Amino acid sequence: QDPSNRYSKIDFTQTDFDVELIRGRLKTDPDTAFFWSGRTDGIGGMDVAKKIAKNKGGVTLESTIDDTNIVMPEWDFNTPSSVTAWEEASNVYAEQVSGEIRAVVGSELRPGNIWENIELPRLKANPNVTKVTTIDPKTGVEKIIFER
Ligand SMILES: [Cl-]
Ligand SMILES: [Cl-]
Ligand SMILES: [Cl-]
C-alpha cells in the first residue's frame, strides 16, 4: 500500500494479476486524476487522454501504471482475465482519487465501457470527489457533469 514502493518492475504478462499488489502504485495526488473513454468523430483513445492530462497537469490510469513500473496484460474484449484485470485496476484507481476529477469522454462509447459502467458510479459514491468535468477528445469542450 506504500506509494514509495514504486520502482521494482511488476510484470503482469509474466505473473498472475492481483490488484492488491499495485494498490499503493495506483494512488494519485488530489485534483490530478483523469479518466477517459470513447471517441468523437473517431478522435480519442488512451493516448489522446494522456496528452490532454499531461498538458493540464494531471495523470491517467495508463500513465500511472507506466510511471510506477507496472506492465498490465494486453486488454482484449474477448480475453476474460485481461478484462477483469483492467476493471479491478480502474476500480482501485477510482477508489483512491480525491478532489476535482476530469474525464476525456467521446460522444461514441463502446458497450460495456469501464467509464460509464464502473468508474463514474465509483466516483459518484466517493465522498472525497467534489467535481467531475468531462473534456471532449476532439473539440476540448468542457462540461461539469457532477459537483457535490
Ligand atoms: Cl481500457
Ligand atoms: Cl455500455
Ligand atoms: Cl473501456
Numbering used by the authors: 252 to 399
Paper lines:
We discover an ADP-ribosyl cyclase/cADPr hydrolase (ARC) encoded within a bacterial type VII secretion system in Streptococcus parasanguinis, which we term Tac1, and demonstrate that this enzyme rapidly hydrolyzes NAD+ and NADP+ into ADP-ribose and ADP-ribose 2′-phosphate, respectively. Indeed, a single molecule of Tac1 is capable of hydrolyzing approximately 12,000 NAD(P)+ molecules per minute. This rapid consumption of NAD(P)+ and the release of linear ADP-ribose and ADP-ribose phosphate species suggests that, like toxins belonging to the NAD(P)+ glycohydrolase family, Tac1 inhibits bacterial growth by depleting available NAD+ and NADP+.
To better understand the molecular basis for Tac1 NAD(P)+ hydrolysis, we determined the X-ray crystal structure of this protein to a resolution of 1.4 Å. Like metazoan ARC enzymes, Tac1 adopts a mixed α/β fold containing two lobes separated by a deep cleft. This topology contrasts that of characterized metazoan ADP-ribosyl cyclase enzymes, which contain seven α-helices in their N-terminal lobe and three α-helices and a four-stranded antiparallel β-sheet in their C-terminal lobe. Despite low pairwise sequence identity between these proteins (18%), our crystal structure strongly aligns with the catalytic cleft of CD38 (Cα RMSD of 0.97 Å across 67 equivalent positions). Consistent with our hypothesis that this cleft forms the Tac1 active site, substituting any residue in this cleft with alanine profoundly reduced NAD(P)+ hydrolysis. We therefore conclude that like metazoan ARC enzymes, Tac1 hydrolyzes NAD+ through a cADPr catalytic intermediate in a manner that is enhanced by Glu516.
